[PDB]
Amino acid sequence: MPLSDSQIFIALFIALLTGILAVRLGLELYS
Amino acid sequence: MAAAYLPSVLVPLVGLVFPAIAMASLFLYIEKE
Amino acid sequence: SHAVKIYDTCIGCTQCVRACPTDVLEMVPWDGCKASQIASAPRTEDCVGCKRCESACPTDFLSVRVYLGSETTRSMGLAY
Amino acid sequence: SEYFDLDDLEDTTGSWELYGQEDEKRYPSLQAEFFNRAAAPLTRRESLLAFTFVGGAGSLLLWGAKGSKDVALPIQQGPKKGGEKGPRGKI
Amino acid sequence: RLWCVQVKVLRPESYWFNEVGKVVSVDQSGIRYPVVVRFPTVNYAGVSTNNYSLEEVQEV
Amino acid sequence: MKNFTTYLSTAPVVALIWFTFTAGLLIEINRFFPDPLVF
Amino acid sequence: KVKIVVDGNPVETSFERWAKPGHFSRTLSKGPSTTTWIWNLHADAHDFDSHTSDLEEISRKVFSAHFGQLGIILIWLSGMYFHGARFSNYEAWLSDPIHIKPSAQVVWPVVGQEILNGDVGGGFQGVQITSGFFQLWRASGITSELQLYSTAIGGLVLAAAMFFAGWFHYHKAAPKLEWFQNVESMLNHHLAGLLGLGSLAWAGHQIHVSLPINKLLDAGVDPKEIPLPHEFILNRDLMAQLYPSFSKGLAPFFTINWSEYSDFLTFQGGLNPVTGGLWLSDQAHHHLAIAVLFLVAGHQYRTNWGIGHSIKEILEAHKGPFTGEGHKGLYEILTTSWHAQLAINLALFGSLSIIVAHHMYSMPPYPYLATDYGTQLSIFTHHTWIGGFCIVGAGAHAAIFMVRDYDPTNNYNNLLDRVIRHRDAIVSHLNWVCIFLGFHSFGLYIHNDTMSALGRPQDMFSDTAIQLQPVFAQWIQNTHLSAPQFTAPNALAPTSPVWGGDVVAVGGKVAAMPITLGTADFMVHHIHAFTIHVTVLILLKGVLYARSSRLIPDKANLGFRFPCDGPGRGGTCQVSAWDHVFLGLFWMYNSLSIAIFHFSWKMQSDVWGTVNSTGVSHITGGNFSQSANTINGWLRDFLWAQSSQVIQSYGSALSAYGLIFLGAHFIWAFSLMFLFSGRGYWQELIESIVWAHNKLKVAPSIQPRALSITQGRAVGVAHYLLGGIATTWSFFLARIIAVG
Amino acid sequence: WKPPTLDPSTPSPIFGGSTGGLLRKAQIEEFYVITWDAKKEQVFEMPTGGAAIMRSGPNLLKLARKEQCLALLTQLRNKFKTDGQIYRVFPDGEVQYLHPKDGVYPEKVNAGRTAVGAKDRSIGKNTNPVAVKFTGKLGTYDV
Amino acid sequence: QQVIQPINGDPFIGMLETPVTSSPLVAGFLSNLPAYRIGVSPLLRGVEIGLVHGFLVTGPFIKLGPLRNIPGVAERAGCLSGAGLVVILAVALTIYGASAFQGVKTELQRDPLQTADGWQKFSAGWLVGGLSGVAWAWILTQTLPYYS
């Protein structure tokens, strides 16, 4: 049984939040 | 696959748009006096 | 710029000064050796880092030492 | 004498204009006026980067979603021969 | 210390560390490295002589 | 003759003679005793 | 006034300096302190101008060394004739040159190596040879081992004469410097006397010996029943039987009735259909015409009778508005610098060897050479390699001249001075040309490989897709095919079958045929242009910047051969002109490897093969035009497919090639340890090893050193070249011997 | 002795020009001038490549690098037995006298010079790199 | 007679005056290019240069692109590809200006092009001229009589 469109969008949104946290860590490590 | 249009959007984004932005911004950062 | 430090084993033979292609080195009076002179490095802003001076030095181990440092237009030997 | 300390350091260092000529009158007035108002919003470096970014990204995703289908790129048609057959009876 | 006496080099950065050379002369004017020593082998620069302090050589 | 024998005592001439002797010895052993694998 | 001038007994003949290694050098004569002295003795042995600055002594050394080289060459040649006389199947091959493989080396039975004595035919076992001596001996008219023995004995006598002359002209009667500087006399004598009389004498041999014997051989007479050459000398009626104009004797020559001699001085063109070689009568007429032209050419220069040219006057007259003082000062350079002469002569001699390779494959001058595919491939490849090495040497000795013999006082606003004064323009323009050529030659292959992998053959550069036809070369081919009709009317046939026309077949195998050129040929020719231009860039940049650069302004004071000027100025490794020779050798290797690969694949695919009723079955079946437009095509269909013979050669007579294939791969890889590393590491490792020897009291007195930086580079490039070239050698020879 | 002043009215050697001379760096960063007094008119080798003719009397030559000036000066001193002076010239017009810095060549010991870079120890007495961690010094030679 | 001389008579500036550099035809032709009109505004010189270069790049894209064998689609695809290249070069010109700008005699005023603001107007002119030239190339493939 395949995944739904909503599951892919959920994963992409959680990854976008994780990427925001990553940018935050990278900027903190920089300065 | 579900949402099968997504590769046709994200592959140009990650392969062309993001690298162009990245090298333009990084060029501007590393040449800044 | 490169750092050129002189040590006290120098016998004042002047060979490093003659070897230098950018006039970094010069002989100054001293009382530590028989020749009554010691190499000095007052112009390391012009030092390219070729280590011709170290090749010229006869003491064991070397009495002139070149420590390659931050690179400049002069130290990179650029004419452009 | 190819050296002079002041008022001729440009000639001493060879800072010459070999081909550039001073000229104010090249283009017609209406043509110029048209092109200054055409390229006026892009005379700021942030606006041109924003314009080229938005236009290029939109052209690229519009190509990927729709334009690649319209020109019948093979990656958009997909397979029609049923799949390549592997060894050992594998699919 | 004597002329032409064997000495052992104790300078660690010297090519002839722990080796035995021959005293050529000793400067008597109070210079920093007065003992001139000749060696049977050349170093990496092709040199066979070097100057040492009194504490840098040991009479053998 | 002394100078000539000194030349024959130079390192490559001695190497040539010694290795000719050693190679010839090995070749003639393998000619007289063909295919030795074991003792 | 041109005259003989020598010094009597200048150097005593004694073994005293034989007992003193390094006697020739002031630095080396004191003997070693370290192992570096051992290498320096060999590296400096033939550097005469380093030993002394006296031009007379240098010139005498060069003259006598040349005699020594000639003696060595004559020993080698006499050896080849002797091995033909004693250890060969030459007479059997003469009776049957289509089925019998030439062999002139036989191995002794020990440690199993007698498997290398292959069953080559003619009741004979031996190593198959690819030098082409049998075809050359047959063209000369040699029919017996006795004549091969006679040439071998005469060669050894002449070899002894050359060695006597070198001793004599160094130790007894050494010519003075003004004798050597008689360049006008030397040019007159070498043009008229060496080349002109050499060609005339060889035309004499061809007419009186090679023509009748080969005519009888191609008629089918048994070689043992052919009359000996002196029978054709002594019996004019016997020669008139084969060439009826000989009955008139020398009277047609002296009455300018030269057209009577048309039976043996011909202009047929093309190839003899019996043998696949050029007509020997054409060769006789060619060598006669060459002899006359060179005999005239040797009367240009003034020596002692007023008439003639002064070379200095000619050079000083040729100057123009673009070029300042023109060729002024070049006569002084070329009469005082041996290195300038060596640079010129190496450049032209190497270019000549390469031209020889192309002309001999296309117009095979020896009978049964063209269907001996191993011989054809071998001689093309060999002469190509000799040419490339000589050209790299030309670059080296040009640079050595620039460092050691150049004098700015004698070159003010002449051509050399003006070339130096715009070296940046020359090098930058050549750099751009090399980048453009690399992009638009190799990137076409990369485009094709990528298109083919993506399943888009219609987007490829190919004969069945986007075409790149070499239309200029195709037009040249058509012009040379049509030449006997209009532009060379008295020539019966074109110079070569490669231009067009019919297959020349010998013994059911193709000797020569038209070589068509399509898209793959366009692409590989632009590869050749690219690789040659890059090699030129490296060598020419080494020459132009040998004395100075913006980086190192006093480079001439550092010499021709030095490792670097230290890690400063960013790092100056390999700035020397010697290091430019070092890099140019690699690019010469790359270039010539692609050239000989192009040759091997194109001949196997499009020329060589067997003839049937239907047509020609080529060795690799025309697959060059199908796959040589991709790198994967080269890797699979040339390298992978054709290496099957060398890697399956074990247990056959070709197994030596399989072993050499592996060993050459090894030697090539071994070279990378020298090229990729640096001597500081090795010197420290030697310090630890020396500690171990000191502990056991086995340390040598000659203190071990790592190789110098320059020697590390020289060892690396020598083993790289040896390994790569011997790999291709074994691959080629196993392949073409097994499938030819 | 006082540092000499660069005379801009000095003639240049006779040269036909080359591609090896000054570039944009002379306009925007710095360039160099070597002056010398020639005993006679003669040919010398340019450090940038090519033959040039030095004029009898004072000569002036502008060059891109200090090393080029010192290479030419080495040639003048060893081949023509001629002394010379080297200046550094800045785009704002400032001229700095370089060589010989105190009127005496640096290989000849001269009173009034002070040692810089001197270490009152042999080179094997330098401390360990662990001892200069987190100090900001360039290395063990710096202390 | 000699036709190669030092640049402006100065033997020590690293350049030579040759017939290629300093023929009246070459120096006259180069002076009238829009790059060398020092007093003319950088925006309009950018417009002219962009028109020229955006027009010319469409040709290889039309005749050699992946869709070159599809009638009608070939021209539109080649022109869209040329427009993409023009936009990429506009970005390159803009980031050049932001980084590169942070006397001259024949006395001459320096080029307004060689400033940050002047280069940004040049980049805007390049973009407008380049897109216009690409559009005109497409119009020409739709209207030229002997186009094929």
Ligand code: CLA
């Ligand atoms: C495991 C992966 C990893 C981790 C944990 C780090 C961690 C760090 N890096 Mg390293 N980096 C990586 C991969 C990584 N990097 C790779 C693959 C490269 C290319 C070889 C680099 C090259 C690099 C440079 C050149 C610099 C760092 C710096 C940093 C620090 C700040 C990063 C930041 O986001 O600044 C965010 C800052 C900005 C977005 C504006 C400034 C742009 C900076 C100067 C350059 C971009 C840095 C970024 C990490 C590059 C990513 C490379 C990408 C291909 C993955 C931080 C300690 C920076 C630091 O200051 O050194 C301690 C620094 O200058 N990194």
Ligand code: CLA
């Ligand atoms: C993941 C990265 C990526 C992607 C998604 C593409 C996608 C594409 N490439 Mg490939 N390319 C890439 C990386 C990529 N490229 C790299 C790294 C190289 C060098 C190794 C190449 C080398 C290459 C060549 C040599 C060619 C392509 C071409 C193509 C096109 C083939 C499909 C077609 O038929 O279009 C037909 C084309 C059209 C229908 C017109 C498309 C016009 C686009 C949409 C304009 C977009 C505006 C632009 C991006 C603005 C940039 C702004 C800013 C982001 C900088 C397609 C647009 C071919 C071509 O057609 O492109 C010109 C072509 O000849 N590429």
Ligand code: CLA
């Ligand atoms: C007709 C006269 C003549 C001929 C045929 C030659 C031929 C040759 N010369 Mg030249 N020479 C001549 C006149 C001649 N020379 C004059 C007048 C001068 C002074 C201006 C020179 C100065 C000169 C120098 C400085 C050198 C030569 C060298 C050579 C050789 C070139 C390499 C080659 O192709 O070898 C082909 C080899 C052969 C074909 C083998 C047979 C050669 C025969 C035996 C020699 C015939 C020429 C000789 C002069 C005859 C005199 C006999 C003698 C006993 C007096 C070749 C042997 C070079 C060299 O190799 O010499 C050692 C070299 O360095 N020559």
Ligand code: CLA
């Ligand atoms: C395969 C190995 C290799 C490659 C690719 C090169 C590359 C080059 N050599 Mg090097 N060389 C090599 C082996 C190689 N060398 C070795 C082993 C040595 C040691 C002896 C040297 C020593 C050497 C010397 C001494 C010189 C060179 C020079 C050159 C250049 C020739 C000009 C040219 O063709 O530009 C064109 C570039 C190529 C043909 C490389 C392939 C380019 C591909 C096809 C283009 C792909 C673009 C890509 C798709 C776009 C980017 C996308 C990506 C970022 C996502 C080129 C950069 C010469 C040079 O500098 O003169 C100008 C020069 O003087 N080489």
Ligand SMILES: CC1=C(C/C=C(\C)CCC[C@H](C)CCC[C@H](C)CCCC(C)C)C(=O)c2ccccc2C1=O
């Ligand atoms: C391996 C290597 C070495 C080490 C190699 C050395 C020292 C050469 C050794 C050659 C021979 C084997 C040394 C011994 C020669 C004697 C004559 C041996 C006598 C013994 C008899 C058996 C013949 C370097 O010195 C070096 C230097 C610079 C760049 C790269 C390298 C490099 O790669």
Ligand code: SF4
């Ligand atoms: S490294 Fe070179 S430039 Fe620096 S002081 Fe030593 S010799 Fe002079």
Ligand code: SF4
């Ligand atoms: S540092 Fe060395 S070369 Fe220089 S004067 Fe002292 S001993 Fe001589």
Ligand code: SF4
């Ligand atoms: S790495 Fe070797 S060649 Fe390069 S500068 Fe250092 S010592 Fe010289």
